[PDB]
Write a protein that binds this DNA or RNA. Structure first.
Ligand SMILES: [Zn+2]
Lengths: 49, 105, 223, 157, 48, 93, 48, 152, 52, 223
RNA sequence: GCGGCGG
DNA sequence: CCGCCG
């Protein structure tokens, strides 16, 4: 039950190299696997949250 | 098993030993602080015992301090066992009485 | 020695405000309070709802259009518009271009009283026969609001978007050494503020300053 | 813990104020120099105690809150009946507890501001509190600890 | 600096870009709250 | 925790007893009408939006607050089983 | 439907630190750096 | 089981040390099971497993210490238990110092290298006296030594 | 908005019980006074985390 | 709605203050700043330097006097004096007593426009033939000034004492969540104040708020 | 009923 | 052990 779309990452009229990402997969962007995001994180304690 | 009672009368108590026998051949030692506590904490004295100057009345529930006392005393050499009420000797057929179970609620 | 509140403003985005001298530890005592208001209380604008002609749900796709409805509505919340009078509570920008083109925020049909400081924002890309027409609802609000909280329904088939009202991106205050006075232990608070454009660094500062004062008065009647 | 702990720094020379008065002054100037630290191994008291002497318990905290002393610094503080050699942190701790349960006297009767607070020192605190002031009252101290423990935990860094 | 007090947090704190993800654990699967309803026909139980 | 629960526990020979007393008294508070209390003049329980806890918040809350004072009596066999419910309806509208 | 991250949701890093969202803090008062930039998430050190 | 006053003392002390280690490991174990925060981590299996390796060594020390004989024979002639031997290699004139003891006392860390009773080199030496000459097998070959003497 | 006032009014001093996954000892379920809160998750007191 | 400013004051030392409801994270925006002020800005009095005739050092002992120099000076920090008008920037208190008597703070000879609200304050016990004569300086300042920071030199042999200006002792504030029909993510700021008696928690608060406001104004003229 | 999965 | 999905 998860989204599975392919978002084209190429523009009209572009010279493509053999074996180049035409569109990105469900969790791959730029041809890399991505699952979640990179967030800025501080590593310390809060009240108790 | 439940707790319904009136200080069950039958006084046939369990003696909590303070010294352990063999770990290295024969030689008597003071059981570990923990273990003694386990056996005497929140218990009820079957019979009275003056140990280091204080009179620990019969039936009194010996708090943690009290058990420390008994240990401190055992160090000196005034008592090797302890008279205390327990389920192991309850008269109440089906159930156990206040004095025998002890403190811990 | 009365706080010489100086100002160096460049554009409508950046806006540094110096203010010294200040008795021991007030630079901070002011710096933080104002900062907290600046990001949470300041009012502004955001795209509250949109509607594409042949799209029924936000998770759809429009022919001859690269980006998905979600990739789009995502880009719209990045749209920073600017009204000029309270009489502009809810504006509805309209846009519609076809064929081979790159829709930019500049293609919205002008609305005489409000201006778009976000011109080159990329809205979408169209191949051929790319029929894209849409109406984007915009409002003046405050703070953040989940599209699920307001649920705007201009048209039965339009999709509500998330509210991003804070007209500031980042606030920072610095406390430096003394300039004037007979003692060296003093504060030189200078705070630099960053705005998307809707309002100005100064505008903000002032409003915040006001909101603060506004609350101070609430300590009046006891009970 | 981090609030009840005490600090010890480096000591160029013999910390003898055990006896010299030119040791109170000198050792105290050598301190104003770059020589003897606010927490030197000085037997009777490290220069840290010499400089700051707090009358009221509040007196100390405010000095802290103004930047004069850090919570974990060994200072001198006049309490109910004794000039005690402890840190703000420690003291603070006392108050916290003494606050949780109204009977301030019964408070310091069951806590040991002689060592940093460890899980155990606390364990035993709770246990004692239960037997001493009643159930619900202890509940209050727990919440109290919970609260402070957490706050300090965040600002400690 | 805190943010709430604008006062620093005594002692450097490490921070950075860490890659983290959301799991197949929405709380969507997490809150059945029952008041009243259906009972089994053969055995008396509030089955749903 | 709860208002002087320790004081309460002290007033009973066994924990569970307190509960039973606490409860049955909360029942009599609603059944025979909610005016069957003993400490309503000063310091009667209270609520926060409109001082209305004087009319009907929690029952047990009351029971306890009443039991905390030496007003009510509790016993193994204090009043004749049935005669109590008869006299109560009589003296309470 | 759209699944926006909320309090009950659970995230985790490639190293094994798993956890649920306890409180969603307003940028307003959360840990920010000297330069206006605030952080996004605070991982309790104690789990390391 | 045969021990020297030296040997006895050593094993007795080691036992003491391992008791302290067990009490520590225990404390630790207890804390873990009490935590119930992070389970399924090498928190239990390690603590436990560690405590075991200890208890085992303890059972070995108590066993040996519970039934060992003490041979007070510092004045003897033939190499027996407790005997401190010294062997010189005829060729290199190398002086080797060793002491044969019961399996439980062996320890290359000691002043005289304490060799097991039922140790090859250990076997070779028992039953011989100053002057004798004997061989055993060695990866490089086989080197004969002459018992130069035998202190207590 | 008045209903909430009501709900929060009906709950005043009542408490509910909470249960952990495997109920092991009597403390596997404790009682607490509920205080209405935002979101889906359930706020639990830290100190009792050890119990359950 | 309008922040209900409730008050619960007992005496002139304690003062509980509640103020809700308030928007998201605002109690903290108010509270902290006020605290920062309530301890550093509030003007009051504190003993500055002392001088006992026969005494030369800070660590010594006056015969016939149970208290040590240190204890006495300590006691004096406790002293709470109150001036009436500007003309009193620095006043010298004088006090001499002998014999078997308890030296209370009410034993200092009365000064024209100065008042001693800490009368029964125990300063020192004198044994038979106890000669105690000293002169304690008192000033109006703000915050806390370590004896080592100011270093007053009335008499070259006198001793400088840490200054306890703020008549406020400690300040505690809490940001608890409160309900209001629709939403529950609300702030309820309850701030409690402790004063030595010189002024009341209620006055102090106002003074603060004012002081803050006054500073808000200084953001007026650019440059 | 069988696979998977949370603590 | 308790729980949930397909
Ligand atoms: Zn019995």
């Amino acid at each position: 039950g998860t989204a599975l779309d392919q978002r084209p990452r190429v523009v009209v009229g572009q010279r493509v190299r053999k074996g180049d990402l035409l569109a990105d997969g469900p969790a791959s962007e730029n041809g890399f696997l991505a699952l979640g995001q990179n967030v800025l994180v501080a590593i310390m304690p809060f009240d108790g949250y | 098993i439940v707790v319904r009672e009136a200080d069950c009368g039958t006084t046939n108590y369990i003696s909590v030993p303070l010294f352990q026998p063999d770990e290295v051949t024969r030689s008597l030692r003071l059981r570990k602080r923990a273990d003694i506590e386990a056996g005497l904490y929140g218990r009820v004295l079957a019979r009275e015992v003056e140990v280091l100057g204080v009179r620990l009345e019969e039936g009194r529930y010996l708090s943690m301090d009290d058990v420390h006392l008994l240990i401190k005393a055992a160090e000196a050499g005034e008592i090797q066992e302890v008279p205390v009420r327990s389920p192991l000797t309850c008269q109440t057929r089906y159930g156990v009485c206040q004095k025998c179970y002890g403190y811990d609620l | 020695k009365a706080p010489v509140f100086t100002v160096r403003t460049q554009g409508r985005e950046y806006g540094e405000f110096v203010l010294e001298p200040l008795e021991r530890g007030f630079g901070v005592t002011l710096g933080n309070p104002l900062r907290r208001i600046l990001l949470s209380s300041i009012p502004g604008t955001a795209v509250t709802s949109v509607y594409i002609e042949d799209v029924l749900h936000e998770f759809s796709t429009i022919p001859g259009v690269k980006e998905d409805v979600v990739e789009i509505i995502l880009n719209l919340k990045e749209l920073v518009v600017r009204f000029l009078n309270p009489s502009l509570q809810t504006v509805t920008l309209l846009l519609k271009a076809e064929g081979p083109k790159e829709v930019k925020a500049r293609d919205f049909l002008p609305v005489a009283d409000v201006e778009i400081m976000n011109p080159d924002l990329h809205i979408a890309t169209l191949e051929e026969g790319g029929r894209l027409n849409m109406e984007v609802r915009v409002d003046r609000g405050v703070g953040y609001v989940p599209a699920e909280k307001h649920g705007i329904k201009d048209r039965i088939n339009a999709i509500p978007v998330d509210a991003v009202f804070s007209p500031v991106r980042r606030v920072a205050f610095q406390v430096e050494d003394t300039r004037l006075g007979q003692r060296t232990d003093l504060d030189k608070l200078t705070l630099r503020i960053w705005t998307d454009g809707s309002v100005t660094p100064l505008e903000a500062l002032n409003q915040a300053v006001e909101i603060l004062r506004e609350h101070l008065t609430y300590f009046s009647n006891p009970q | 813990y981090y609030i009840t702990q005490v600090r010890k720094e480096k000591k160029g020379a013999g910390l003898e104020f055990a006896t010299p008065e030119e040791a109170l002054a000198a050792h105290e100037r050598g301190e104003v120099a770059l020589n003897a630290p606010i927490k030197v191994a000085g037997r009777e008291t490290s220069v840290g105690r010499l400089k700051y002497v707090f009358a009221n318990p509040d007196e100390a905290l405010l000095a802290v809150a103004h930047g004069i002393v850090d919570l974990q610094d060994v200072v001198t503080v006049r309490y109910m009946g004794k000039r005690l050699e402890t840190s703000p942190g420690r003291i603070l701790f006392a108050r916290i507890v003494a606050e949780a349960v109204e009977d301030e006297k019964v408070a310091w009767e069951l806590i040991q501001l002689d060592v940093p607070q460890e899980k155990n020192s606390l364990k035993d605190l709770v246990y004692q509190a239960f037997l001493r002031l009643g159930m619900e009252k202890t509940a209050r101290l727990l919440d109290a600890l919970k609260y402070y423990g957490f706050t300090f935990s965040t600002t400690s860094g | 600096y805190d943010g709430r007090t604008g006062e620093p947090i005594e002692g450097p704190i490490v921070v950075g870009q860490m890659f983290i993800m959301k799991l197949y654990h929405m709380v969507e699967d997490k809150m059945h709250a029952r008041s009243t309803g259906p009972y089994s026909l053969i055995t008396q139980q509030p089955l749903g | 925790a709860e208002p002087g629960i320790d004081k309460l526990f002290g007033m009973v020979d066994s924990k569970y007893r307190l509960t039973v007393v606490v409860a049955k008294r909360a029942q009599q508070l609603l059944r025979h009408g909610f005016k069957n209390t003993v400490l309503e003049p000063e310091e009667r329980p209270k609520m926060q939006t409109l001082e209305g806890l004087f009319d009907d918040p929690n029952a047990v809350t009351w029971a306890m607050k009443e039991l905390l004072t030496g007003r009510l009596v509790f016993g193994e066999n204090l009043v004749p089983e049935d005669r109590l419910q008869k006299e109560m309806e009589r003296l309470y509208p | 439907q759209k699944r926006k991250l909320q309090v009950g949701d659970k995230l985790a890093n490639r190293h094994g630190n798993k956890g649920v969202v306890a409180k969603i803090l307003p940028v307003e008062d959360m840990p920010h750096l000297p330069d206006g930039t605030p952080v996004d998430v605070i991982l309790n050190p104690l789990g390391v | 089981v045969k021990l020297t006053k030296a040997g006895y003392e050593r094993l007795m002390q080691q036992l003491e040390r391992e008791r302290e280690r067990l009490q520590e490991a225990t404390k630790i174990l207890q804390e873990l099971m009490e935590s119930s925060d992070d389970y399924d981590d090498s928190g239990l299996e390690a603590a436990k497993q560690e405590k075991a390796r200890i208890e085992a060594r303890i059972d070995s020390l108590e066993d040996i210490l519970s039934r060992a004989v003490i041979l007070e024979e510092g004045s003897g002639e033939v190499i027996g238990l407790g005997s401190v031997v010294e062997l010189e290699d005829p060729l290199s004139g190398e002086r080797l110092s060793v002491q044969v003891v019961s399996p439980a006392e062996a320890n290359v860390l000691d002043t005289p290298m304490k060799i097991s009773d039922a140790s090859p080199m250990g076997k070779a030496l028992l039953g011989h006296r100053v002057g004798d000459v004997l061989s055993l097998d060695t990866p490089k070959g086989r080197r004969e030594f002459r018992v130069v003497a035998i202190h207590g | 908005d008045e209903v909430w006032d009501a709900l929060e009014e009906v709950i005043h001093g009542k408490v509910v019980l909470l249960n952990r996954a495997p109920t092991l000892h009597r403390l596997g379920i404790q009682a607490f006074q509920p205080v209405l809160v935002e979101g889906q998750s359930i706020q639990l007191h830290p100190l009792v985390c050890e119990a359950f």
